[model samples]
Target: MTMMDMNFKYCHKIMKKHSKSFSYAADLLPEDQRKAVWAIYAVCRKIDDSIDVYGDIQFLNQIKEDIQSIEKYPYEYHHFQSDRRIMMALQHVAQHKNIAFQSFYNLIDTVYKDQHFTMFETDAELFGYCYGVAGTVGEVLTPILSDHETHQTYDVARRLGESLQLINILRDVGEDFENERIYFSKQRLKQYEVDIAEVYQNGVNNHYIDLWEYYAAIAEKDFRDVMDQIKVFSIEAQPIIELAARIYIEILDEVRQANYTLHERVFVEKRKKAKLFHEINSKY
Candidate 1:
């Protein structure tokens, strides 16, 4: 097989391995769009690891270099340090589909902001972060999925991406707290009468769990609302999204079942996941 073909297969493997819950949904796109989704996933996963696996300083510096390179070369093929296997994989999709540099830069900009700051006190603050990180990816992917016709679908996809990010943060509350990072807005936390100390001490209390469920429900509802628009792409996209949402919701349920102790690393059983995947696919 050609290198491009190899990368396509490798993208599938990465999705299955890393984005297990969401990969099924992403894989529902046509082959080219699926590859583009994999590329986006690989890039996002790289950014996530830079902050999570490495220290904040390292991640910050990497983001800085990336921003600079994208600025300096906008259209040139410049290599970045964090642009290792994953970025290389994404570059294939970006180059093939002419994914713009600004979207990637915007995503990096958010990473930079995240590395330096914490404590978003307002709803606006939280939404800004989501827009930069997830909405930006939606903007970038629209062109790839639409084969370059961006005007019609970009906004909807961007909303979907932001909604997905919100859902992820809600479901991973325990995990995020364990890492000493809280993504939920202070306003929401205060509404629930929750504080950082409470999160650290109890991990999952009724108040916090309820808060998470509320957000998760909202995110799921937003995804459903956008289902009509997403169907314009391919039938595969909708089911993949449904399966991903259900799987993530299942994780939230597991967290509640485990009493919100994110330190334990909860997961759905393989058989159950397979069953759900099949059932959802059949429905779609």
Candidate 2:
């Protein structure tokens, strides 16, 4: 088997261990594309974990440098990263798919900011953060899944990524607070009359739910539009991308159903995920 196949096994387990629904949607891809996507997912997960799980900023920066090094000089790829397979797999995917090295750095730079984040401060900063953390994945995934990798396509991909991040922020409000990183901008929170600190102490209530729906609507608008956005991607990749988007929208549904509660995180069940997969398969 090729090294892509070899590394796919490692990336596959990482995605499966971390993001159940996302990894499930990924499984719907054609063999080669699926493996390529796995590498991208694993790379992002690794960058994010450097801070979220390990809480190591220096480790995150090393990953940042490792990506830059491998992208520039493939001959030295073996010497850079702690997990050589992630770089090897990514280098292979980038060269073949025409994905940019800067796309990965954008994500790394964004997560690096998470190390000492105080507040999102403004709506622009919040959205910018989401684009970095999630939308850049869209940028990276564009050439891999679509032949129509144009500015407009990246815009749409970014919107979907931002939507997913917003959904993520909504779902993980309590968890984020526990980690001492509040993604909700102080301005928006003030506008929504949401006292996040109070919510952290008091639990979900009407005021927080109101603010929650406001953010939810912002995210839902994009995923709902994702129905039409599928036309931009390759036909082979479209079904799984659509399935993944639907899965995220379904998670949004669960969070809203819970009235934006943070007592527990939100998720979809295996049966429900299967139905989405089956529906995508039958229709597309």
Among all candidates shown, the one with the greatest lDDT: 2
lDDT of 2 by residue, 88-198 (tens): 887777667777778888998888877778797898999999889899998888888888879878888888888889988988998888877788889989898887779
Off-target runs (Cα >4 Å) in candidate 2 are 1-4, 74-77
Model 1, residue 170: C-alpha shift (Å) = 1.5
C-alpha lDDT of all candidate models, in order: 0.70, 0.83
The alpha-carbon lDDT assigned to residue 222 of candidate 2 equals: 76
What's the C-alpha lDDT at position 82 in model 2? 54
Each model's number of backbone clashes?
1, 0
**Which pairs in model 1 have colliding backbones?**
25-240
Tens-digit lDDT track for model 1 on 185-272?
8898889887756766655667867877777777777777766576544444556655665676677677668776656667777677
TM-score of every candidate: 0.79, 0.94
Clashing pairs in 2: none
